[PDB]
Amino acid sequence: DPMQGFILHTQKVKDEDLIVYILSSKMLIKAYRFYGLRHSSILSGYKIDFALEENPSFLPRLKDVLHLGFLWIMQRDKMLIWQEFIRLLYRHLKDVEELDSFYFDLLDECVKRFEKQNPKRVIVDAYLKILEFEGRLHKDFFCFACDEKIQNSITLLRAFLPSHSQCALGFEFEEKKLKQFYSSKNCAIFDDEEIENLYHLIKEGL
Ligand SMILES: [Zn+2]
């Protein structure tokens, strides 16, 4: 039975084999690939079609691997950003087994949007969806530190946690624009430098 997934991480084992961590629509899989170091289809961030052979008391063996390429796979700039996000997502999901199809479907949509959109903008939009799906999005701007309302200029920290600029160091964004971003799920309201700063917050960890 074929399955599809995104490779989130690989680790060399034995001479040329790989342990391959794969996000599917049902599960984060930890699988064993014979001679995986030789296989140009097996790289973090790649999407694959594959099958699994179950093994008693051991990892499933990764078989029947077909690389599902991206239209933009040759653009090293975009692939760098993609692999940064994938590594952040691996660390976020590292201890998870079963999970919602949300995560696989989110990555599928990112890959599509990567064709024509700015990769950092796509990741910023995607992270907003992760926060909302996990119930971690603070749409009310109450300061994490002093518990008071924050108005007009909002400081954001890791995981878009809100603060007064006088209460914590982070990056500042206009309230009206953050509200538009959170409502529309579209970071188009922010200019390029604001996107860069949201992306720096994402790189603190999901
Ligand atoms: Zn405060």
- Cβ atoms of 49 and 2 within 8 Å: the answer is yes
CATH code for position 52: 2.40.50.140
Residues 49, 97, single domain; the answer is no
| The two structure tokens encoding residue 40 | 């140009």
Packed helices 102-113 and 76-93: angle between N→C axes, nearest 10 degrees? 170
Report how far ligand 1's centroid is from the alpha carbon of 179 (Å).
19
Distance between CA 138 and CA 40 in Å, rounded?
A: 41
Same domain, 61 and 131: no
Give the C-alpha separation, 156 to 167, whole Å.
Answer: 11
Which residues on neighbouring strands pair with residue 49, listed in sequence order?
4, 66
145 CA → ligand 1 middle, Å: 5
Residue 173: partners with Cβ closer than 8 Å, 6 or more residues away: 153, 154, 156, 190, 194, 198
- Structural domain ending residue among the three candidates 50, 68, 86: 68
Q: How far apart are the CA of 162 and the centre of ligand 1, in A? A: 9
Residues 106 and 157 in one domain: yes
Cα(182) to ligand 1 centroid in Å equals: 21
Distance of CA 39 to the CA centre of its chain: 24
Which residue from 74, 76, 21, 72 is spatially nearest to 43, judged by alpha carbons? 21
Q: Is the same domain home to 90 and 189?
A: yes
CA 200 to ligand 1 centroid distance, Å: 21
CA-to-CA distance for 134 and 128, rounded, in angstroms?
10
The reported resolution of this PDB entry, expressed in Å, is: 1.8
Same-domain pairing of 115 and 187: yes
Q: What are phi and psi of 28, to 5 degrees?
A: -90, 120
65 CB-near residues (< 8 Å, 6+ apart): 33, 39, 41, 42, 48, 49, 50
Rounded CA separation 139/33 (Å) = 43
Euclidean distance between CA atoms 83 and 147, whole angstroms: 36
Within this chain, do residues 96 and 151 fall inside the same structural domain, yes or no?
yes
Q: Give the chain's radius of gyration (CA, Å).
A: 19
Distance of CA 2 to the CA centre of its chain: 24
Query: For residue 147, how far is its CA from the centre of ligand 1 (angstroms)?
Result: 6
| Ligand 1 centroid, distance to 126 Cα (angstroms) | 27
Rounded Cα distance between 174 and 168, Å, is 16
Distance 195 CA to ligand 1 centre (A): 24
Q: How many A from CA of 71 to the centre of ligand 1? A: 45
CA–CA separation, 157 and 36 (whole Å): 39
Distance 92 CA to ligand 1 centre (A): 27
The residue range of the domain holding 60 is: 3-68
Centre of ligand 1 to C-alpha 164, Å, is: 4
In the reported structure, the alpha carbon of residue 155 is separated from the centroid of ligand 1 by a whole-number distance in angstroms of 9
Number of domains in the chain: 2
> What does the chain look like in DSSP terms, one character per residue?
--EEEEEEEEEEETTTEEEEEEE-SSBEEEEEETTGGG-TT--TT-EEEEEEEEETTEEEEEEEEEEE--TTTT-HHHHHHHHHHHHHHHHHHTT--B--THHHHHHHHHHHHTTTS-HHHHHHHHHHHHHHHTT----S-B-TTT--B--SEEEE-GGG-EE-TTT--SEEEEHHHHHHHHHHS-GGGS-HHHHHHHHHHHTT--
- Reported as half-sphere exposure (CB side, CA atoms, 13 A), residue 21 has a value of 18
Using what technique was this structure determined? X-ray
